[PDB]
């Protein structure tokens, strides 16, 4: 009965933003899911490929948990087949994804008077993303056909800053979103429930 570090993935102090998908791997665990229920009042618990209550009777090979920080709108934006500045340039979720998404608020915890400015996201890449892709691409982005050293005339920097402050009302109060990814593939199933 070796419990899995769901507590140590859900109780960190610097959940990396969308731009470092911070993906943790799950194996040789027991998937206690009462912690997935009692922990925080939550704000988004949409499950797509797995029933949200008939899931403890399943045994999985591997589970991938990604750990970010987004604003209010992007929480609803995270979904299969979606568009926008977070669903196409920083984190893209495959249409055939089967799992659950977790998103619960954190302000007292992550905002800060004076403000946060570490969670950094991306806005303009050359092309479209592929699902489950990291692209820390610190490449002064360009356009205008005058590719440039950058950060200047039509020379932009890919990243941006999340101004986070403890008074922002809901809509952009820094939410903490972590996505649970499963796969129902024939293999030696190692992560079973009690």
């Amino acid at each position: 009965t070796n419990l899995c570090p769901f507590h140590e993935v859900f109780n960190a102090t610097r959940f990396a933003s969308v731009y470092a998908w911070n993906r943790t791997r799950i194996s040789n665990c027991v998937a206690d899911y009462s912690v997935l229920y009692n922990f925080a009042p939550f704000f988004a618990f949409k499950c797509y490929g797995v029933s949200p209550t008939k899931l403890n009777d399943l045994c999985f090979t591997n589970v991938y948990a990604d750990s970010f920080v987004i604003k209010g709108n992007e929480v609803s934006q995270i979904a299969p087949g979606q568009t926008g500045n977070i669903a196409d340039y920083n984190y893209k979720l495959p249409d055939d994804f089967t799992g659950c998404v977790i998103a619960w608020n954190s302000n007292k915890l992550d905002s800060k008077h004076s403000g946060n400015y570490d969670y950094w996201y991306r806005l303009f890449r050359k092309s479209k993303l592929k699902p489950f892709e990291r692209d820390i691409s610190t490449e002064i982005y360009q356009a205008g056909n005058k590719p440039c050293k950058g950060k200047g005339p039509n020379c932009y920097f890919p990243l941006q800053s999340y101004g986070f402050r403890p008074t922002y009302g809901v809509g952009h109060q820094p939410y903490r979103v972590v996505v649970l990814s499963f796969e129902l593939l024939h293999a030696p199933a190692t992560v079973c429930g009690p």
Binding site: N73, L123, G163, T167, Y168, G169, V170
Partner: protein
């Protein structure tokens, strides 16, 4: 590869960085509004300097984008808002001359003090003149005071105003505007919208048509004003000539609200007064704002988020810290909206609370829109949307429904007559004066009048339009109308006119959707969520598409109209047309009080 995408990317940036900087600046502004200590003064002097520097740099960078190779209308208007260089188009010397003279008016108007012939009493514009006018009825005190204030404020601010006119004409000609009047006209400019395009002179023709449709009303109400005032003061006002300037109820004739005590038709009926019932139930700021929330829920608009109640100051924070609490609420954004306004246990505070809540609801309505569009579709929507809520809450039907007025009560005839007079003299008194200051600033920037008869033409057509006569003749060595606040600090005035007409247009449309029958001044938007959705259909729009489409989304008419103005005061105007059967209608321009 095309300019459209490059502009979109630059807009993305401007959006995000401007959001961050503006949130910083406005949060520190709120820190002013509550904690006025010397250090925070510095803090957002640097913060505003940073915000202005970012705005200037972003505009300079955006100037490389041509508007001839861009098609998306949202992008069109975002870029056009970016490209208004304003004062930066001129030379550095001219810009610093402009801003230093701006600072000079600020200082002079904020510090203009008048010494009485006994110099002992040092008095200011506020609250001294406000008290003197709205409290005292003496002719001599009013005349001496206002004449002295005019005679010293002009003496300092006349050539300053002349050089303002010169430099602003130069700036407008620099920015491809014929005159600075066209610069203030540019706000209503909409292009690239079929069936929705509007020029700069089309609104001028609209306003002239509103004159053609409104004149008899104001001539007629002026007739009662003079008749009642000559009943109170027979030897000082002619029965046919115009009313003299220093008898309009306030500092510069803008509001006739103080003329109530002398112009109430039936002084024995009781006016709607619920304050007593406020201390009956011991209502408070939390309770009054919660009542406002119940109202706005009854129109299906969304709630106040926890941050509102948690962080905004809602009642005066004792005497240790000083707060200037003119009812205000600016757009921090990201849901983080807040209000400071000193809450006393009164009805004026109730009306201002509903007005500010209209402001807040409108401001949250376009929260998802980009930064350059997070504003009212024109400058006159925000205040009108705020004031319609106050007007709706002012009816006694709402007071009965919420239990703030005794249910064993029926709408009383001569009391509601006084009530219509209340909302009449607080509104229509502003119209001709606002119209008219705005027309003079138009012709000043147009240059149709030379330097040497400004005041003469001012006061002659003041006699012929507003029916106002100088009780002292003044020569070209005067700049009397500059003494007002907004003219002293470079804001437009059609905002007040657009507010006034648009609010009645919205109220007409909403009460038509509310299916209210009977007297229109008794209409209430309560438990009318279909009307709430109708309003929200425009509320969410912001500046993305032209304001006339938003106006149609409520009324269905692409242009402003006078019909709500006419219809709102109809039974009122019947009572008055039957009352002027024994009094002269119209004024003579020749009579002046010192022409004997």
């Amino acid at each position: 590869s095309t300019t459209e995408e490059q502009a979109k990317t630059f807009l993305e940036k401007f959006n995000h960085e401007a959001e961050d900087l503006s949130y910083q600046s406005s949060l520190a502004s709120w820190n002013y509004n509550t904690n006025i200590t010397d250090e925070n003064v510095q803090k957002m002097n640097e913060a505003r300097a940073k915000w202005s520097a970012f705005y200037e740099e972003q505009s300079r960078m955006a100037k490389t984008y041509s508007l001839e190779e861009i098609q998306n209308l949202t992008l069109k208007r975002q870029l056009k808002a970016l490209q208004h260089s304003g004062t930066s188009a001129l030379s550095a010397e001219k810009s610093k001359r402009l801003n230093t003279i701006l600072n000079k008016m600020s200082t002079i108007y904020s510090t203009g003090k008048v010494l009485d012939p006994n110099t002992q009493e040092c008095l200011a514009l506020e609250p001294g003149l406000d008290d003197i006018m709205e409290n005292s009825r003496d002719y001599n005190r009013r005349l001496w005071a206002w004449e002295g204030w005019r005679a010293e404020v002009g003496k300092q601010l006349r050539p300053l105003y002349e050089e303002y006119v010169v430099l602003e004409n130069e700036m407008a000609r620099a920015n491809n505007y014929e005159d600075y009047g066209d610069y203030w006209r540019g706000d209503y400019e909409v292009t690239g919208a079929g069936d929705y395009d509007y020029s700069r002179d089309q609104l001028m023709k609209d306003v002239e048509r509103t004159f053609a449709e409104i004149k008899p009303l104001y001539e007629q109400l002026h007739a009662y004003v003079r008749a009642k005032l000559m009943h109170t003061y027979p030897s000082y006002i002619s029965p046919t000539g115009c009313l003299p300037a220093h008898l309009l109820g306030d500092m510069w004739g803008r509001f006739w609200t103080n003329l109530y005590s002398l112009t109430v038709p039936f002084e024995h009926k009781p006016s709607i007064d619920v304050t007593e019932k406020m201390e009956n139930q011991s209502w408070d700021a939390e309770r009054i704002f919660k009542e406002a929330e119940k109202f706005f829920v009854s129109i299906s608009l969304p709630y106040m988020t926890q941050g509102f109640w948690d962080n905004s100051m809602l009642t005066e924070p004792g005497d240790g810290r000083k707060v200037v609490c003119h009812p205000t609420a600016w757009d921090l954004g990201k849901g983080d909206f807040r209000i400071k306004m000193c809450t006393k246990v009164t009805m004026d505070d109730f009306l201002t609370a509903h007005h500010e809540m209209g402001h807040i609801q409108y401001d949250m309505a376009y929260a998802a829109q980009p930064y350059l569009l997070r504003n009212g579709a024109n400058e006159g929507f925000h205040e009108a949307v705020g004031e319609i809520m106050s007007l709706s809450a002012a009816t006694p039907h709402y007071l009965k429904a919420l239990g703030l007025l005794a249910p064993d009560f029926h709408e009383d005839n001569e009391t509601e007559i006084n009530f219509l007079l209340k909302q009449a003299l607080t509104i229509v008194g502003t119209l001709p004066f606002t119209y008219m200051l705005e027309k003079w600033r138009w012709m000043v920037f147009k240059g149709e009048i030379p330097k040497q008869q400004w005041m003469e033409k001012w006061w002659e057509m003041k006699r012929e339009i507003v029916g106002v006569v100088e009780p002292l003749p003044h020569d070209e060595t005067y700049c009397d109308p500059a003494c007002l606040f907004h003219v002293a600090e470079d804001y437009s005035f059609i905002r007040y006119y657009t507010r006034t007409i648009y609010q009645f247009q919205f109220h007409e449309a909403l009460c038509k959707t509310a299916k209210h029958e009977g007297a229109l001044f008794k209409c209430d938007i309560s438990n009318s969520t279909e009307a709430g959705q109708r309003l929200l259909q425009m509320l969410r729009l912001g500046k993305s598409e032209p304001w006339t489409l938003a106006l149609e989304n409520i009324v269905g008419i692409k242009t402003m109209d006078v019909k709500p103005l006419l219809n709102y005061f109809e039974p009122l105007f019947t009572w008055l047309k039957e009352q002027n059967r024994n009094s002269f209608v119209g004024w003579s321009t020749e009579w002046t009080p010192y022409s004997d």
